[PDB]
Amino acid sequence: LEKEPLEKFPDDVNPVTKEKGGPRGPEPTRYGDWERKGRCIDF
Amino acid sequence: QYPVVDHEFDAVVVGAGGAGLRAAFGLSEAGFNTACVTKLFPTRSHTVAAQGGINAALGNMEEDNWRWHFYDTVKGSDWLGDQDAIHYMTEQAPAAVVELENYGMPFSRTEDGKIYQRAFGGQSLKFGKGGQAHRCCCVADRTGHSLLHTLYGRSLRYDTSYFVEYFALDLLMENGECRGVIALCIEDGSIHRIRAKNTVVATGGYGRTYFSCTSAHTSTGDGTAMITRAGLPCQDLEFVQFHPTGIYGAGCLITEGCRGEGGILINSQGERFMERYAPVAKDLASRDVVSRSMTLEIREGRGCGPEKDHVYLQLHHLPPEQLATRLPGISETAMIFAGVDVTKEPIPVLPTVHYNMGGIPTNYKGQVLRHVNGQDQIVPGLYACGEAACASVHGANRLGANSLLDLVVFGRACALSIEESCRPGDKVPPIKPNAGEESVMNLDKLRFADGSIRTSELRLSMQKSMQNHAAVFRVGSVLQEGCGKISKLYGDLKHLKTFDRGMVWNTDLVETLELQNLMLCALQTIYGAEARKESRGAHAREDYKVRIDEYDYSKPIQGQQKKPFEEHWRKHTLSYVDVGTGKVTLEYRPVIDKTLNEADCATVPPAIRSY
Ligand SMILES: *Cc1cc2c(cc1C)nc1c(=O)[nH]c(=O)nc-1n2C[C@H](O)[C@H](O)[C@H](O)COP(=O)(O)OP(=O)(O)OC[C@H]1O[C@@H](n2cnc3c(N)ncnc32)[C@H](O)[C@@H]1O
Ligand code: NA
Ligand code: NA
């Protein structure tokens, strides 16, 4: 994640969900597929 | 004459992706002297790109039940999935994920210390009636990378023998049993006969039969092709899963969120064409509808670009702040993969292959099948797993996050089957002194080929033909035209020209072998699609729009005449090729409806497809 990196969380703990060691930045499944930086990884 | 080196192992695994590594690790951990033959370095296998999820009914976020995952997978398969293999996979998934965690894969965790799980892939609770399930597990943003490093790393202490940058050419078959594999050492050009009592084919997919796919150029169906060259059937090769919006020239898919955030699809006339095909839902229509609509735009002459072969996804009307905050990273992705500035220009996109449901037919134990006089039979000594196989857990349509799962479950199954039937050090069957000679003859013919057609030109012609005749839009006349074209291109293999005659790192030669393999996969895909006169899962025909089962499952079964096997389509396609002539032969075998234990997991009868 060079120019537009996904937000890394303190202690790798998502402050909203408390997930530890999971996906950074916005929730990858929020549009129904699995997105990273606008790429669809899986669906 | 070529330097020919013979090796002897207990087992040989062809492939070092998630499936092959799971099998090789399992065999080595159990004490089998195991070779793993891989054309790529293990951690460069396509599995490394699988950043997302793996499904397992752990029940950490709510009550779950693996039988509900079974149901979702059967329904998703559109009743072409074999319910015994689906039972096996879904019942094993919770244990498989916990095993991987124990081996060192750091699955993300809830506050309470359980593996965190997400809703994904339309999965449900309570046999479709319980709302959304949350059973999709992951590691940070790198699940597949973590899987490969975990299994590859753990195998090293058990002394798995890796043959890296070796290209498997053919199976060593003798009297209907597999006795190993013959392979090319790509670095030095030598030929290696790797004898073993059991062989596992885990070579991945064949997406590169098409013009746009999500895999790298090395996903060329090589294991499929080895099976075809042995006279063994491939299965369900017409069932290819597409996504509507892959970046033209790259194959990188972009999220439906681009349209959810307000992006729109445009054709060469500047029109928002989804308003025509889906007046209500527009660009947020279903993926199947968007894929079909984009394909018709291109077919009917409204494609964009010099070759009118894609359409546009427009985002530059959205305020840049929204793009940056709602779709962080899309600018970087569009620049990297398309050289496009999304604030100024649209992203060129077209439907793109993502997954191959079809492949080498197996039973639920990973044993490869032949089909003789209407009877399934295992091929002694031969196994397959992962995307190269067709167990078939996915039937006519793979569910999201089930593809990483199949790798670990069926790679493990192959190892377990071998362990249950054999012991380390069992006598390795011998091979005839000239075993493999036809593979060497073919290699030599390509190495000194001096025809008139470049490998890359023939490959591109095949890929374009598959994209234009055998992709999302399927109708008889077009499929029949495509069949003729692929058959003509198969004949053109005899006119190839190669440039490199050397023995050191002759990748020109490897690319030509891969083209031969791709062409065998393409032939079987398109002829199977032409023959299958129905719509099921990923195979949608304009001229046969209905799923054709042994009954009309939209109506009560009482009083219907059940259709003879030969009069319905709820059956697997088996394809064969006479490699010398290109002649394709199709046969069919029943779908397995029985589970492994009906009291534990009931067969799910076919039901109408819900949209
Ligand atoms: C393409 C893709 C797929 C994918 C994904 C993202 C992308 C970009 N994300 C996924 C996800 O988040 N969750 C999921 O459940 N699935 C996802 N997928 C699908 C999944 O990743 C793939 O289906 C899966 O990884 C396939 O694994 P498999 O082990 O079957 O295959 P592979 O990783 O491609 O490895 C193939 C190996 O075979 C060797 N090989 C191939 N041909 C030869 C020859 N001729 N000789 C020797 N070795 C050969 C390759 O070297 C490789 O090691
Ligand atoms: Na593999
Ligand atoms: Na497959």
Author numbering:
A (entry chain B): 66 to 108
B (entry chain A): 54 to 664
From the manuscript:
Respiratory complex II (CII; succinate dehydrogenase, SDH) connects the Krebs cycle with oxidative phosphorylation, making it a master regulator of cell metabolism. Although data are limited, the synthesis of a number of findings suggests that CII activity is regulated at the level of assembly in some biological situations. SDHA maturation requires FAD, dicarboxylate, SDHAF2, and SDHAF4.
First, it would sterically conflict with the binding position of SDHAF2 that is observed in both the SDHA-AF2 and SDHA-AF2-AF4 complexes and with the binding position for SDHB in assembled CII. In addition, the changes in disorder of SDHAF2 and SDHAF4 allosterically affect the angle between two domains of SDHA, which modifies this same binding surface. In the third step, the additional organization of SDHAF4 displaces SDHAF2 and forms SDHA-AF4. The active site dicarboxylate-binding position remains occluded in this structure, although we note that the dicarboxylate malonate binds at a distal position in the structure. This distal site is of unknown relevance to the CII maturation process.
